[PDB]
Design a protein around this nucleic acid. Structure first.
Ligand SMILES: [Mg+2]
Ligand SMILES: [Mg+2]
Ligand SMILES: [Mg+2]
Ligand SMILES: [Mg+2]
Ligand SMILES: [Mg+2]
Ligand SMILES: [Mg+2]
Ligand SMILES: [Mg+2]
Ligand SMILES: [Mg+2]
Ligand SMILES: [Mg+2]
Ligand SMILES: [Mg+2]
Ligand SMILES: [Mg+2]
Ligand SMILES: [Mg+2]
Ligand SMILES: [Mg+2]
Ligand SMILES: [Mg+2]
Lengths: 145, 87, 217, 182
RNA sequence: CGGCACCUUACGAGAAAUCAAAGUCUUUGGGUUCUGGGGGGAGUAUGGUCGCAAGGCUGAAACUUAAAGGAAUUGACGGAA
RNA sequence: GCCCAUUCGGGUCUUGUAAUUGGAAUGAGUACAAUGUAAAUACCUUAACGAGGAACAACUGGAGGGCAAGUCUGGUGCCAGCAGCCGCGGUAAUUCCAGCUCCAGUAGCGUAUAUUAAAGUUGUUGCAGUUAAAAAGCUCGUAGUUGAACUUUGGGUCUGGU
């Protein structure tokens, strides 16, 4: 068996073409090419996005572990799209409140779900210009209302 | 193998098969030393003197081994009429 | 509490086989374990991992423990021993014994130029077990044991000081990987070089020579 | 617009974090040659690593032929000057295996302690930090100085400051003042 | 000499069933075409094109999910023997 | 470590712990000066003051595995939460929330997204296609890619080097 690919000394262009063709099966590559992040993906293919807290929503978790996961329905400012952001640590949701500006981040999985929280893709990071972790700690205090 | 100026490094310097040349490994459990006693005139097999042959294991497994041995013997001068050059 | 079966064992006891080198040369089997110990006092025995392992039964399951052990020194000898028993310590012991029985030499060669003492492999050698191919490429000096942790450990045990690897297929089948590595190591002595073109004498074995001392009375 | 001032993120982390044995070894090394962090060790490794790479490259060409002959030789000379290489070993293939320990041993860290002066590694380091020790007659206060061997005999206590014995130094002065008052 | 075909060892292979090719591959390169890149969403949406149609060829993404598979081992089981 | 170990013990020699205490520096701070400088700052240089746990105070993350390090104590009791993944939670939590310990890195360390490595999981080097995804149902066939062996081999005679 010569094994598929042409092993000729002048078979280079063909090989290149083949490689290119193959490239469209690789998912990451495809994404990079087509601008799926730029055309979809609530964020603009960005790390973060500021968004308005439309409402506090407890979401029921996937399976095995059973609980309500204190998420927030956020409306992204730049695009106008509506997403659901999980809110970390104990309480935290109280701190976040309602109708606040909220700086979101990706959850970890380059999109996709994060473990058990179904239909949820984002960590709330900052609420109206602080930081959720900090608030939880009480190392830093909130700037009043 | 030979460091600096001789000083033979690497022990266990292996038995190489008589038929194949093929190195006989440390755990070549199949490979064999045949000892053929040295002949003398009118009976007599001369105690403590042999033509020693090593056979690798691969050959034995194949069954091409006996023939090889015979050939070797012929080459040496332990046989006549047995192993022909052409078949 | 010694007492040997095996002609070879008897010979060893007597004290006419000096080192394991002779044994290796005459590819003599070592079904008994103590012989190896006698020969080589510097056997470092290191347990690599222990899988729990379960046959399924009409009621419950049969938990046993596949203990993998690597044995060595820094001379150029290694042993790989696998056993699966229910008592863990016992299993480990068994594995160790197996490794000892195996113990196999390694041709340690030169990186490039002779200069000092050799502590890499001679040739690009590779092994295989299931879907693990461990390929050991000889390193330069000081460049270390570039390998998967288990593999590295094995190399250390052997007395290979510097080496490159390329472990491919499912390396996380740890035992399998180890086996592959062992195979590769073995293949070192077996790969013919131009150093060994020259013809050897074929020495008589200890089993032939010291035949009266071996065997029972 | 002048020109980019160049730098190197010189001193590089290992590829796994928690190889336990490795960590232990590092710790031991630190203990031996009183380092503040693993960072120093990493730096040392990088330094040595580069050298090793260079050696390898040289080998990959024919010794007798030119670049290999010359550049390699130069490197060897440099190493000798530094005092990591021995005088028995000047054959390039010896550099190939230098080891980090050796490198550590050449520091003004240890070349204080090795020559007495301090008493106990850490103490020496402290002394170096606190504006004592002049390798020439110019006050080194970097622990990771790397002594030149050619200027290792010249390592003294500082011309100025105590221990060298120019001025007694602050606490002593205070004590004297107190005595006077009394 | 030719196509529609068993046994052992495999040193050759192979994840193994097995394979005299599914061998001469980490000791990696005889010459070529074509196809595949976790599972689903989906042979769908869309556009093309081909058709009398039914359908065909061509062929997505969003979104979703930690398994989907393969081979076998021991079990358990079977209105199998 | 031990001169000796009829029991001790001196402790002749070397190390670690105590809000003991004591002498010796220190520059981080400040500050005449002088340096710098276009003028200044800041640096380097100096006088003078400035360290003893109350400071002249190191944070970040983690402490089941992957993966270095707690089967510690309470608070909780499918909750609230952690958890990249595996997963932990249902009155015995080493995974949640606090103290102590402890680890890792250290004036840095975390998180997010990209991206490179790892990925021989894009493969020319270097993958797979009997069954795991994968051989067009079959043959024909232009481009392309490739394509059997054969023409000057061998010997001498000097002559430069390394
Ligand atoms: Mg559940
Ligand atoms: Mg001063
Ligand atoms: Mg898919
Ligand atoms: Mg902390
Ligand atoms: Mg935590
Ligand atoms: Mg905790
Ligand atoms: Mg651990
Ligand atoms: Mg508890
Ligand atoms: Mg890549
Ligand atoms: Mg693949
Ligand atoms: Mg298929
Ligand atoms: Mg088909
Ligand atoms: Mg079809
Ligand atoms: Mg031709």
């Amino acid at each position: 068996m010569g094994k598929g690919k042409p092993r000729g000394l002048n078979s280079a262009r063909k090989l290149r073409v083949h490689r290119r063709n193959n490239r469209w099966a690789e998912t990451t590559y495809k994404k990079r090419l087509l601008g799926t992040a730029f055309k979809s993906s609530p964020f603009g293919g960005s790390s973060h996005a500021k968004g308005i807290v439309l409402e506090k929503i407890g979401i029921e978790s996937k399976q095995p572990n059973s609980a309500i996961r204190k998420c927030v329905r956020v409306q992204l400012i730049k695009n106008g799209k509506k997403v659901t952001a999980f809110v970390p640590n104990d309480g935290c949701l109280n701190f976040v409140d309602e109708n606040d500006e909220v700086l979101l981040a990706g959850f970890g999985r380059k999109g996709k779900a994060k473990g058990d929280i179904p239909g949820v893709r984002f960590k709330v990071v900052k609420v109206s210009g602080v930081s959720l972790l900090a608030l939880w700690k009480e190392k830093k205090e909130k700037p009043r209302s | 193998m030979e460091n600096d100026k001789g000083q033979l490094v690497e022990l266990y310097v292996p038995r190489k098969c008589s038929a194949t040349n093929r190195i006989i490994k440390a755990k070549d459990h199949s490979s064999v030393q045949i000892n053929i006693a040295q002949v003398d005139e009118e009976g007599r097999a001369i105690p403590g003197e042999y033509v020693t042959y090593a056979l690798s294991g691969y050959i034995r497994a194949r069954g091409e081994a006996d023939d090889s041995l015979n050939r070797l013997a012929q080459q040496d001068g332990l046989l006549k009429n047995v192993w022909s050059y052409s078949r | 509490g010694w007492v040997p079966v095996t002609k070879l064992g008897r010979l060893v006891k007597a004290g006419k086989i000096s080192s394991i080198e002779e044994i290796f040369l005459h590819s003599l089997p070592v079904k008994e374990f103590q012989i190896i110990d006698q020969l080589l006092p510097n056997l470092k025995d290191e347990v690599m991992n222990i899988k729990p392992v379960q046959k399924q039964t009409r009621a419950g399951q049969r938990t046993r423990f596949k203990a993998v052990v690597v044995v060595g020194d820094s001379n150029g000898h290694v042993g790989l021993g696998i056993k699966t028993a229910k008592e863990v310590a016992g299993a480990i012991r068994a594995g160790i014994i197996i490794a000892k029985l195996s113990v196999i030499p390694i041709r340690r060669g030169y990186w490039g130029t002779n200069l000092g003492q050799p502590h890499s492999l001679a040739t690009k050698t590779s092994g295989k077990c299931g879907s693990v191919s461990v390929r050991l490429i000889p390193a330069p000096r000081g460049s270390g044991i570039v390998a998967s942790p288990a593999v590295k450990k094995l190399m250390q045990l052997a007395g290979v000081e510097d080496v490159y690897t390329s472990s491919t297929g499912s390396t996380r089948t740890l035992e399998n990987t180890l086996k592959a590595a062992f195979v590769a190591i073995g293949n070192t002595y077996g790969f013919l070089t131009p150093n060994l073109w020259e013809v050897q004498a074929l020495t008589p074995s200890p089993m032939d020579v010291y035949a009266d001392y071996a065997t029972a009375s | 617009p002048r020109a980019p001032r160049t730098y190197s993120k010189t001193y590089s982390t290992p590829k796994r974090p928690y190889e336990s044995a490795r960590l232990d070894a590092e710790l031991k090394l630190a203990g031996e040659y009183g380092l503040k962090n693993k960072r120093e060790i990493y730096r040392i490794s990088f330094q040595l690593s580069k050298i090793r790479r260079a050696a390898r490259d040289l080998l990959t060409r024919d010794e007798k032929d030119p670049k290999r002959l010359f550049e390699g030789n130069a490197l060897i000379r440099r190493l000798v000057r530094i005092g990591v290489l021995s005088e028995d070993k000047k054959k390039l293939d010896y550099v190939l295996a230098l080891k980090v320990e050796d490198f550590l041993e050449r520091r003004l860290q240890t070349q204080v302690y090795k020559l007495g002066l301090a008493k106990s590694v850490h103490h020496a380091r402290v002394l170096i930090s606190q504006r004592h020790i002049a390798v020439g007659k110019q006050i080194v206060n970097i622990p990771s100085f790397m002594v030149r061997l050619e200027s290792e005999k010249h390592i003294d206590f500082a011309r100025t400051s105590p221990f060298g014995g120019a001025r007694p130094g602050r606490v002593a002065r205070k004590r004297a003042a107190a005595a006077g008052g009394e």
